[PDB]
UniProtKB/Swiss-Prot annotation, chains A, C:
It is an enzyme of class 2 (transferase). GO terms for biological process: keto-3-deoxy-D-manno-octulosonic acid biosynthetic process; monosaccharide biosynthetic process. Its main location: cytoplasm. It is found in: Cytoplasm. Keywords: Cytoplasm, Lipopolysaccharide biosynthesis, Transferase. Its EC number is 2.5.1.55. GO terms for cellular component: cytosol. Belongs to the KdsA family. Gene3D superfamilies: Aldolase class I. The gene is kdsA. Pathway: Carbohydrate biosynthesis; 3-deoxy-D-manno-octulosonate biosynthesis; 3-deoxy-D-manno-octulosonate from D-ribulose 5-phosphate: step 2/3; Bacterial outer membrane biogenesis; lipopolysaccharide biosynthesis. Oligomer. This is 2-dehydro-3-deoxyphosphooctonate aldolase. GO terms for molecular function: 3-deoxy-8-phosphooctulonate synthase activity.
Length: 256, 255, 256, 255
C-alpha cells in the first residue's frame, strides 16, 4: 500500500518559508512515487512553554499560506486545530485535520474535526496507554470520521524525557493506521537530533503506515523546535533509507 | 487561611448540588478558620467513552452553581474547556479551574486571567514541578493575581499515577499549592483506600489547601464513582487534616 | 508500639567516626525512650558507580568496629551483607541483617540471612512493585525469619531519578513491618537534602513502623553519600518532629 | 561478526541442552557469517517464588554445558550469581554473563574479568544507558578485554518494561551491544507477540548481536515459559534479521 510521509516546517513562520520547503517536497514526491506526501505546518503553537515564544501569524494567514502551497504544488495539506470552532475554517484547505497530543481526549474537538468529512490524525497523548486509543477512534467514528490515523510521538518517562515504546505500533494498528512522529519523540519536554534517524529506522522495521517529520531549511534559525527540525537537505536521504528498510522488513510484518 | 475545595465531580442535577452544598455549608460554619470553596463540573469534556455522562450544559451548570452560592453563601469553582467559556463562568465562579490536560493551552489561561477571577491550574500528569513556573507567568502576563497550582499525580508507566510530594515545596515558590486527594489515586484509562493516607502526607509536607470530590452515594455517581468520598466521611477527614496541620505546620520550610 | 529509628554514618570510614555518631545516638536513646534505636553503617559499599570510589576497610574490621559500638553504648546493630557467606560472620554482631535493594530478590542471600536467627530488613528494589514484596517475605519465613522488615527507599522514575509512592507503605504493611529510608529516597542514581525532612514528615503522617536515616558529623566530608547524609546536629530535631507528627496522626492510621 | 546468543532459559536437563544444541549447531553451519553462542542458566537465582524451579546445581550445569561444547563445538555462555562461581564457570564459558540485578556488584564484575574470559553484562532495569560507562571501566580495571552490554528493557511503572532504543547507540560508545529479545518484553512480577517486532527494530537501529531464549516446547518450560521462542521458529527469525541488517547497516551511525 502507499506509504505516507507527513513533512514540513514546524510553524508557519512566513508564506515564503512554506513555498521553499514545499518546493523540495514537490520534487521528492516526483521521485518517490510510491509515497503519498502531505505538507504540514501549524498556523499556531498553542502551548509554547513561555508566554514570550513565537506562536504564529493567526489562523486566517495560516490557512491562506497553506492554500498557496496546495495551489502552487498540488500537495495535500495537514495542520492542527486547538478549539472546536477552528475545524470548519481549517477543513477548507486541510486534507487531514491533526489533533494535538494534549487534546487527544477532548470529545468536542474530536467531534468537530470528524464532521468536516476530512481525514483525522490524532497525536497520542504522552500520558496515554496504547490500548486506550481505542476509544479515541470510537469517538471519531461516532462523529463521522472514515479515515483515521493515530500518531506515536513518545510517552512520559520521568521528568523532561520521553520514551518510544514500539509495542504501541502493532497495538494501535488494530483500530487505525499508524504514523510515527520522528521529530517530537526525541524532544525533551520543558531534544536530541542524533536519535531522529535511528528511531525512524526502528519504526519502519517494526511496521507503520507512515512517518511524520518536521523539516526546515535552517533548523538553528527556526522559531520553534530548532533543535529537532531536520535540515531540508537531509529529507531525501531519510526517505530513501526508510523505504529500503521498509521493503526488506515488509514480508515479516505481522497481520492484525 | 487553609483552603478546602469540595463537591460532587459532575453537576448531575442542581438537586445533588444543593444536598452536598448543605453539608459543606454546615462544615463551613463548624470550621471557621477554613475557607470552603464549592466545586462541581458542568461538563466532563474528556470521558474515555463517547457513551458516558458529560453533563447538562454550561448554562444549566452555571445556574445550579448560582443557586448553591445564593442559597448557602459559598464560594464557587468549576473548570472550563475552551476560551469562550471563561467569561460566562466567571459570573459565578470565584475561582476558575484549568483542567490538567489543558494546563499548557495559552489562550485558555489568558481567557481565565482576563475575567479578573482567581485561577486554579491542575498540574498536567506530563508536567515536571519546576515547569509550572511558566504556567504561572502566563497567568500573570494575562493579569491574574490570585493563582493556585494543584498537585494531582504524575504519569507512572501505563494506567497509573504517582504523587511525587517533592512537587509541593517546589511549586510553592511561585503559587499557592492545592493537593487533589481524589484524582491522584485514580488509575487512568483508582483505590479509595489510599485517599486518606495521601491526604495526611500532603498536610504533613505542607500545602495551602486540599481538593476533594465527595458524593452522597459515590456508588451511584455518574463520574468518578470509584473515587468520590461519601459525604458523611468528609467531616472526620477535615478535622484530621486540621489537627495534623496544626502540629506539622511548625516545620514547614520557608517558601 | 515502639517506633524504630535506624541511624548511623553511611560507611564505616573508621572506628572513630562510629563512636562519635554512636555517642550522639546513645544520648538520644536516653531522651526518646519511646523509640528503639538501631546503629547502622556498612562495612562495604559493594556497588559504588566508580571503581575508584571508597568501598570500606573490609568485613573483619567493620564487624569489629560495630562490636565496639554495641559494647561501648549498649546499642543494637545493623549492617548489610552482599553474598551468602557474609551472613554468619555478620550475624555475630548485627541484631538486624540488612539486604540491599539490588539484591532483594537473591534467594540464597535471603535464606542465608534468615537461618542466622537474626532480624532481617530488606530494602525494596527500585524496580520492585509494592505488592511483589509479598514473595520476598514468604522466602524469608521459609528460611526461618521470625522478625522481618521491608524498607521503602524509592522507585525508578525515568533516568537518574527516584520517586516515593507512599501507597507502598499500607500495601507492604499487610505482610511485614515497614521502614521509610529518608536518605536514599531523595538521592539521584548515577540527591537533594532539601527534600529529606518533608518526605519524612509524609511517611509518618501516612504511617510506618520506623525511619532509616544516614547521619554524619560533617556530611560534606563523608566518603559516601555526602550530599544526602544528615548533619548529626539535626538528628534530634528530626526525631522529635516525627514523633510529634506520628502522635497526632496515629488515631487515623488504618488497620490492615 | 554478528553475534547470536541463544538456548533454553534454564538447564532443565542436559538432554534438553543437547536437543537445542543440535539445532543451533545446524544453524551455525547454515549461517557461517554469524557467531553462535549457546546460552543456558545453571541456576535461576531470583525466581519470584521460593517454590519455583531454580536448577540442578552449578556442577551438573557446568557438565551439561561441557557436553554441548564437546558434542557440537559451540561456544558457551552462562550467568554467575556470586563471585566464587566465576572461576569454575570460566572453565567452560567462553563468555561470562552478569545478571541484570547484579550489574553493579563490583566484586562479581572483577571476579568475572579475572578469569580472562569475555564478559557480557545485562543492563540493569534501573540503569541509564550513559551509566554503563562505569560498569565497563570496572571490567577494564579488572583486566577484561572483550566486553558486551546487553539491552533488556527499563523499569516503566510497575510490572512493565520498555525498550528505549536510544540506548543502543549510547552504549556502543564503550562496548559491543547485544539486544535481549526475550526478557525485554516480559512483565516483571510478557507478550511473545512483541518479540519479533522489537528484534527487527534492534537490527534496524544497529547492534552487534542478538540474545534469544528458545525452547522445543516453550509451554512446558520450567522458566520463562511465556517468552521462550519455539525452536522451530529460530531459523526464520535469524534469516530475517540478517536480511534487515544487510540493508540497514548502510545507515548505522559511526560508533
Amino acid at each position: 500500500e502507499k506509504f505516507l510521509v507527513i513533512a514540513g516546517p514546524c510553524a508557519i513562520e512566513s508564506e515564503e518559508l512554506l513555498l521553499k520547503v514545499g518546493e523540495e517536497i514537490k520534487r521528492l514526491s516526483e521521485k518517490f512515487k510510491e509515497v503519498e506526501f502531505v505538507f504540514k505546518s501549524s498556523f499556531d503553537k498553542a502551548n509554547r512553554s513561555s508566554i514570550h515564544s513565537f506562536r504564529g501569524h493567526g489562523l486566517e494567514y495560516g490557512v491562506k499560506a497553506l492554500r498557496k502551497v496546495k495551489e502552487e504544488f498540488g500537495l495535500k495539506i495537514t495542520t492542527d486545530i486547538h478549539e472546536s470552532w477552528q475545524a470548519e475554517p481549517v477543513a477548507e484547505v486541510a486534507d487531514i485535520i491533526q489533533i494535538p497530543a494534549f487534546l487527544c481526549g477532548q470529545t468536542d474537538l474530536l467531534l468537530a474535526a470528524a464532521k468536516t468529512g476530512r481525514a483525522v490524525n490524532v497525536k497520542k497523548g504522552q500520558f496515554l496507554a496504547p490500548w486506550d486509543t481505542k476509544n479515541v477512534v470510537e469517538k471519531l467514528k461516532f462523529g463521522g470520521a472514515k479515515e483515521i490515523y493515530l500518531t506515536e510521538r513518545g510517552t512520559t518517562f520521568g521528568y523532561n524525557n520521553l520514551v518510544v515504546d514500539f509495542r504501541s505500533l502493532p497495538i494501535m494498528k488494530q483500530w487505525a493506521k499508524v504514523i510515527y512522529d520522528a521529530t517530537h519523540s526525541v524532544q525533551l519536554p520543558g531534544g536530541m537530533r542524533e536519535f531522529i534517524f535511528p528511531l525512524i529506522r526502528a519504526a519502519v522495521a517494526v511496521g507503520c503506515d507512515g512517518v511524520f517529520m518536521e523539516t526546515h531549511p535552517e533548523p538553528e534559525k527556526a522559531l520553534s523546535d530548532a533543535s529537532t527540525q531536520l535540515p531540508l537537505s537531509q529529507l531525501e536521504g531519510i526517505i530513501e533509507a526508510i523505504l529500503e528498510i521498509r521493503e526488506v522488513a515488509s514480508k515479516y510484518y505481522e497481520t492484525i
